[PDB]
Design a protein around this ligand. Sequence first.
Ligand SMILES: *[C@@H]1O[C@H](CO[C@@H]2O[C@@H](C)[C@@H](O)[C@@H](O)[C@@H]2O)[C@@H](O[C@@H]2O[C@H](CO)[C@@H](O[C@@H]3O[C@H](CO)[C@@H](O)[C@H](O[C@@H]4O[C@H](CO)[C@@H](O)[C@H](O)[C@@H]4O)[C@@H]3O)[C@H](O)[C@H]2NC(C)=O)[C@H](O)[C@H]1NC(C)=O
Ligand SMILES: *[C@@H]1O[C@H](CO[C@@H]2O[C@@H](C)[C@@H](O)[C@@H](O)[C@@H]2O)[C@@H](O[C@@H]2O[C@H](CO)[C@@H](O[C@@H]3O[C@H](CO)[C@@H](O)[C@H](O[C@@H]4O[C@H](CO)[C@@H](O)[C@H](O)[C@@H]4O)[C@@H]3O)[C@H](O)[C@H]2NC(C)=O)[C@H](O)[C@H]1NC(C)=O
Ligand SMILES: *[C@@H]1O[C@H](CO)[C@@H](O[C@@H]2O[C@H](CO)[C@@H](O[C@@H]3O[C@H](CO)[C@@H](O)[C@H](O)[C@@H]3O)[C@H](O)[C@H]2NC(C)=O)[C@H](O)[C@H]1NC(C)=O
Ligand SMILES: *[C@@H]1O[C@H](CO)[C@@H](O[C@@H]2O[C@H](CO)[C@@H](O[C@@H]3O[C@H](CO)[C@@H](O)[C@H](O)[C@@H]3O)[C@H](O)[C@H]2NC(C)=O)[C@H](O)[C@H]1NC(C)=O
Lengths: 70, 114, 267, 235, 235, 60, 283, 151, 68, 68, 68
Amino acid sequence: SGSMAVFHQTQGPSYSESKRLEFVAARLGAELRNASLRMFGLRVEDEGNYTCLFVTFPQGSRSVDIWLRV
Amino acid sequence: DVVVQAPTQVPGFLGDSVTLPCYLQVPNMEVTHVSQLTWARHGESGSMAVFHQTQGPSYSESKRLEFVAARLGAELRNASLRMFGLRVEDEGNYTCLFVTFPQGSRSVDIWLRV
Amino acid sequence: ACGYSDRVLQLTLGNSTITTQEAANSVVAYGRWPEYLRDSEANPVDQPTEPDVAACRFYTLDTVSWTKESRGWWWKLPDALRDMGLFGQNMYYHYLGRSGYTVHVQCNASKFHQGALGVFAVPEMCLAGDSNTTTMHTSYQNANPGEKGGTFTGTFTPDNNQTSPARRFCPVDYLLGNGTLLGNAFVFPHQIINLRTNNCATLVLPYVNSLSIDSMVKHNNWGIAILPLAPLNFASESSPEIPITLTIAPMCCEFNGLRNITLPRLQ
Amino acid sequence: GLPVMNTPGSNQYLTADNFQSPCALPEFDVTPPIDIPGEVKNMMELAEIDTMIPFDLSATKKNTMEMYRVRLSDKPHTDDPILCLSLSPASDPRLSHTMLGEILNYYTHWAGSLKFTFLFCGSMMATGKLLVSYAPPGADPPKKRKEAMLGTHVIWDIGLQSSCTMVVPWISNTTYRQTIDDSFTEGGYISVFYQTRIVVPLSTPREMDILGFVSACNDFSVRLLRDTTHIEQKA
Amino acid sequence: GLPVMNTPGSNQYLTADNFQSPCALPEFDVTPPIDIPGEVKNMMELAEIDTMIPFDLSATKKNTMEMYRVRLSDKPHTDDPILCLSLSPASDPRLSHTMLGEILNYYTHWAGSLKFTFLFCGSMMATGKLLVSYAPPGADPPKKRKEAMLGTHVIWDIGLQSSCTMVVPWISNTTYRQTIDDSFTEGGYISVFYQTRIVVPLSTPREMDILGFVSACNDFSVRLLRDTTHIEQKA
Amino acid sequence: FCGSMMATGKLLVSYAPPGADPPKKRKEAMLGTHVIWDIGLQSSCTMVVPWISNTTYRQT
Amino acid sequence: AATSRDALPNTEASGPTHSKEIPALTAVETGATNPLVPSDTVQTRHVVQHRSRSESSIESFFARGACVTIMTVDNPASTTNKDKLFAVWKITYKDTVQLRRKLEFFTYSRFDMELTFVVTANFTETNNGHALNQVYQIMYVPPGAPVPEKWDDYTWQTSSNPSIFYTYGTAPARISVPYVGISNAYSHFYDGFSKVPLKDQSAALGDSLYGAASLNDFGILAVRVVNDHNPTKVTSKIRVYLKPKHIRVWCPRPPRAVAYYGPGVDYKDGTLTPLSTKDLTTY
Amino acid sequence: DKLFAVWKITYKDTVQLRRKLEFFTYSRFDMELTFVVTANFTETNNGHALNQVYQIMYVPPGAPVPEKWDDYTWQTSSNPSIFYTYGTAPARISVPYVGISNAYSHFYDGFSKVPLKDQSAALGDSLYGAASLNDFGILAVRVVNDHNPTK
Amino acid sequence: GAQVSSQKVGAHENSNRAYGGSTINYTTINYYRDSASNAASKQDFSQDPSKFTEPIKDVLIKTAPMLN
Amino acid sequence: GAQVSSQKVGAHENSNRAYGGSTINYTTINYYRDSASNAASKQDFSQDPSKFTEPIKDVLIKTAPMLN
Amino acid sequence: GAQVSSQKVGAHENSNRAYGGSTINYTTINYYRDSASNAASKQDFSQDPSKFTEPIKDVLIKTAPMLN
Ligand SMILES: *[C@@H]1O[C@H](CO[C@@H]2O[C@@H](C)[C@@H](O)[C@@H](O)[C@@H]2O)[C@@H](O[C@@H]2O[C@H](CO)[C@@H](O[C@@H]3O[C@H](CO)[C@@H](O)[C@H](O[C@@H]4O[C@H](CO)[C@@H](O)[C@H](O)[C@@H]4O)[C@@H]3O)[C@H](O)[C@H]2NC(C)=O)[C@H](O)[C@H]1NC(C)=O
Ligand SMILES: *[C@@H]1O[C@H](CO[C@@H]2O[C@@H](C)[C@@H](O)[C@@H](O)[C@@H]2O)[C@@H](O[C@@H]2O[C@H](CO)[C@@H](O[C@@H]3O[C@H](CO)[C@@H](O)[C@H](O[C@@H]4O[C@H](CO)[C@@H](O)[C@H](O)[C@@H]4O)[C@@H]3O)[C@H](O)[C@H]2NC(C)=O)[C@H](O)[C@H]1NC(C)=O
Ligand SMILES: *[C@@H]1O[C@H](CO)[C@@H](O[C@@H]2O[C@H](CO)[C@@H](O[C@@H]3O[C@H](CO)[C@@H](O)[C@H](O)[C@@H]3O)[C@H](O)[C@H]2NC(C)=O)[C@H](O)[C@H]1NC(C)=O
Ligand SMILES: *[C@@H]1O[C@H](CO)[C@@H](O[C@@H]2O[C@H](CO)[C@@H](O[C@@H]3O[C@H](CO)[C@@H](O)[C@H](O)[C@@H]3O)[C@H](O)[C@H]2NC(C)=O)[C@H](O)[C@H]1NC(C)=O
């Protein structure tokens, strides 16, 4: 449940590790769409399956799962 | 159930005196009971000249404008309006209203190209 | 009795003293006058610090020139001061800061000039930006002009630059910047400085906010907005110019939770 | 148990209805109210606060500052109105937006005496006497000082006390008037004329402007709430 | 008999509703309650019991014992934080699971002062002084003893009385804070630094660990119940 | 104020105890002890300089 | 003691005059408005005024229940290639102009939101089919709780989420909510940011939109179609009507003059012109 | 366009109640309006329709009368409205003396605008017996549900 | 625990009591334990418009001269 | 056999009584003979967290030294 | 705040009380705060038809001669 980096339509970005990660597109009050993320320096364990969430209105919470094969 | 008839666009001379024709052809066999034929402009609740089925005409500028048809207790239909002396700014898009019963409030929008 | 006629006053908050002579008997926001936080409605649990004289005194911001094409000015109080002596330093040092005010808008002409400046003190003055694309996107750096303050404009101009925008407020005057008619604006605590008569306006504003004590660096409270109601004219002369100058004084202020110094990107 | 009978009007929702209804969040500890400076207990309170009338609504001057400045000059005394106004604190475009006139649209019947306050905004030297007047309906509107004079007027004076207020006494055939431009419930006519002329000394701005304000009096009241025409939600 | 009227909101089931309902087993002789040792009358009681904070959550050390041991060393005095923590007794992964932080997810608003208790778990010989500190929000988080020092701190001492507790006084702009990582209702920043250094004599374990505990104080309270994100039911 | 009955204006007379850069801008002097005086009917003002000093008397 | 249903101070009688008393003359600079009664600028009779402000009271102004939002949801056939529609609206009055202008006259407000639901429904497709009386679930998902993924997921188990099961065709559902504000009045106008930008950080890392306060103040409403995929696809609309009951207001701000634009006070061009034309010298 | 009827509140539409009231010159009464709503499938087509719900919005004298069926006017933020579900106890709403005067005048002798010499015969005319443009008010009634295959 | 109050009848004929004398009351009963569920009691008050109309650092007598 | 109790109103305007003074009550009536059918009376208590927080074979004074 | 009144029974057998003696009452309870919502109490009066039948600038005695 612990969410990593999150970008709120208003509060802006919310990096769980301000450094190794960043939203290469999310730019405040614009229109959230291309939410692709980009994290610096990978890590033997950085490897895995993530959950891309989109609390949208009124469409419901959308979610896709990425195998991050390092 | 009728519809708001009007020459869509109607220009639009400088200092002349044009007639913004706005009639309402109904479905004869089928009837309605008009209440008030009144104008405005568009982005302005403030209504200009209005003609109530009873209170009669209601010119927002008694002079430069007039209802070339609206004649008390008769039957409101041909509500075309005619204003004297145009004005560089008299130019624009208006709203022809018809609070009728029981047909709902009918409304058409005229580009007044001067 | 004597010349204690409404026209003369002598404000003394802190170690500063204003003494105007055309003074239109001052306004007290909503009857309610500025005071400290009664324990009965307090919120944060530590000991609240109170600069008292250290801050409470009158701070003159910087003067604004007033011509014919002048379209009005606007300050954001909590912020407007941010520098002004200790009320500046205490400002930043704490997470919470409840402060009351006493704005004295100074501006005098000769018996031969004419005009009326409506000095309106709007609580929670949310002025509107200038991007027809996205709303509220107005940048902080830009949103809080401080000692200098901003200025109302003639007619709205949409910010088109979008590779990267100008992110500023485009406050139109007839709509009091917050999309609502000026002619109806006389609802907020206010005074019209009408050059013929009074040569200043004094409004005492008690801290107003949905919270007991709130932030400062963040959230703003009162906001002054001076607009020329009657445009300035003097003699068949090209253009005349009188200089309007406000002096504010933070009253009964208190701040909670001391930390390290806040250093906002104001540039 | 207890034999009851569902009555005509059951299972009927009525927007403005007032019935007790189950609470969504049971027990939720509500946050204690503080004493925020500036409460309001009744709308008609706001109605008693002056709001500047946008007297001029000429295509050029409308929707822009110039709309509230009613200019007066040092022109040789004339007998023509330097402003008019149909007492319809709801209908007449001139009042339709002022706080008073803005609250009046959210209602179907207004009543009570109104009070127009005029502020001379011009050079301390300029003097003069302006006759602010009101004449109840049903008669030719007044177009000459000679005709307006006959009605209810307050021959005001431009001096030290920079402003005046002509109360328009509630003189009407019904207990409330239609907050719509209705003919039967007509308002009346307001109109300021020069009782002398605005005289000025040399080296003075010869064209000063006056600002008018309007508000209700502890007598005014409104009834039967509706939706203001003023703001539309397109699509 | 008795003319009634079904009101808007009838035949409507409301999960958290509280209405009397017919009893399925009429007369069933309920079994008398005994006096079981250890009753609980209100959740916030549990909130006042310390639960060890899993301070370290590094891919390697997470979800395994090593996660609660915050190791300290006999390294030459430095001015860098030997732990951080965003005061969000609900949001910050470091607190999100502790009893307190676990109960805080079943709510939408928390309030009141918290109390972090740190236990020095190491050789009876080792001594030293650690500065546990808190700094209310809206300012650069503290990264140097020099900056953290300025806030609310308790310069603790590793001695006979093996544990300390730095109460974090409820200093906040609202009456309750969002139990979600909301920016407006920010928590603040907690952070322990070495005020000296952990000094040890020869033949002593040079790397002892400290365990941190957290709990609410008779002031804390929560409101507006919700469903904890913590446990999911897949299919 | 020794000048024409018509002329108006507001002058800020100010004092700032020692040990700090003398004030050269209204912006800096303003911070100290000042009496923002007004040129009107009452033709004169008086800004008392409160005895603020580290010793009981000062060297003349 | 002076309640809203009293009776305005009766008009006292008054004859001629010639006093040095000067009621008529004001001076607006003072900001104070002359409380002149009709009895001052004219000779008045003794009217026994019955009229009362009982209807304009702050409580009665907001006595009618306004429509805060509409919510489309639909139950399609099992064989539908598309996922089943369950709408989710974020509690916030700011969606329609009406209730939004009334509230906006005042700077702050403390009210008890009393939400009612008028749910309707028709058969989408031309196909001539049938459908057994549907039942809807209107789950209140509190600020921060998990917003529903699929139509039928665990989130809807609702072990602790105030929810209502409305059976179609019946007295429209109603649930009262008490002041759920974090502060001491819902701030109809918030001046300032939710995150201050700090120099020792990137322009991004610490930015934010003007006027925005809490991420989810009021909350969110999840509304599904509770029954299973039925051959005849039926779309429904749940119009929610919010009526502020036990209410209080502070600081009388001037009403919105030009058409609303977004959640923020901001305003689009064009719509910028509100007033109407009228000759400065024509009645 | 979808049909939503709009009737102007005024008893004077049917002979019955209109003769009873007419025996008296003036009247002060509390109008207690009830609604018996019915409904059938127009076309020969054999179709179905989920129990419709109607909105009966009272649009006070002077308020904006509804343009399209589904427009903003129906948001009803301040317009006393009733949502009747088809097939149920017929809807009822009591109304107190909403008169501007002190009795509804069943017979008004005189005009709503006097003609004045310094004006055109038109500018100031009017129908005999007519008083207020909209005394009682108007009733907007729509079909609240969406366009359904079976009309 | 009945909450009986007086309605503000406009002395209407045969309404229970008017210009023949008499008063009119109505019973109320809070049914839910949670206050925010009670019927808006409409027995609201009315303050003096002074904190907005007449707000000054002094006092204003109407018959007196405004700008003293 | 009415069960009238006081609600815990947050002194809301025109709710019946607040910052103008007054109290707010609500009637209840157990209708079924079987107790396990009564409405959860929500008038629950609160014990001291001591049997869990402060449980020792002695007594603990806070200002005192823990491990004596 | 019950409004109990007496019905005007036509002394019907076993109606509660008649030609065996007794009276008949009926309970009423105004439920809505707004008076114009109360049930038409039907306890209306009756004036003398004189303001219409016998209206003269004098007095008329029946046994007397009309046109005196
Ligand atoms: C990320 O996810 C991918 C995709 O799989 C999907 O997500 C997973 C996280 C998981 O939820 C899974 O259920 C879902 O489909 C993972 O890749 C899959 O991993 C699974 C389990 O490890 C694989 O299962 C095996 O499949 C191969 C061939 O398809 C079989 O040879 C193998 O043999 C059997 O395995 C089962 C148990 O899995 C035993 O019971 C039998 O005895 C026998 O050994 C498995 O069946 C599956 O093949 C993978 N799918 C794909 C498309 O690659 C991936 O592991 C996740 N990433 C990480 C980093 O973990
Ligand atoms: C009166 O109304 C007419 C008709 O238009 C209709 O009413 C309008 C009031 C308005 O509500 C509109 O939405 C509605 O359709 C107006 O004439 C139209 O005006 C619009 C906007 O100015 C025109 O839009 C342009 O169309 C031309 C060609 O059709 C394009 O070349 C042009 O190019 C683009 O413009 C858009 C924004 O409009 C930009 O975003 C692009 O970058 C690009 O520049 C526009 O698309 C439209 O063409 C006109 N329609 C017709 C039928 O003439 C008229 O202006 C109004 N009168 C007055 C006096 O204003
Ligand atoms: C969503 O946005 C991201 C980044 O904002 C996009 O990813 C990247 O987009 C950039 C800009 O087009 C691409 O860079 C371009 O390509 C070359 C080499 O590929 C690069 O060296 C230059 O900088 C050039 O501008 C980049 O290729 C691309 N990266 C990836 C992994 O796609 C992304 O395209 C956006 N997604 C969508 C669907 O648009
Ligand atoms: C609605 O009524 C208006 C005016 O009442 C009609 O407009 C005008 O009608 C007159 C009378 O027929 C037309 O005048 C006639 O034509 C010539 C030249 O066009 C004119 O010089 C003479 O006066 C002659 O009688 C006039 O053309 C016409 N104007 C316009 C702009 O149409 C209008 O016809 C009516 N509308 C409908 C739908 O009937």
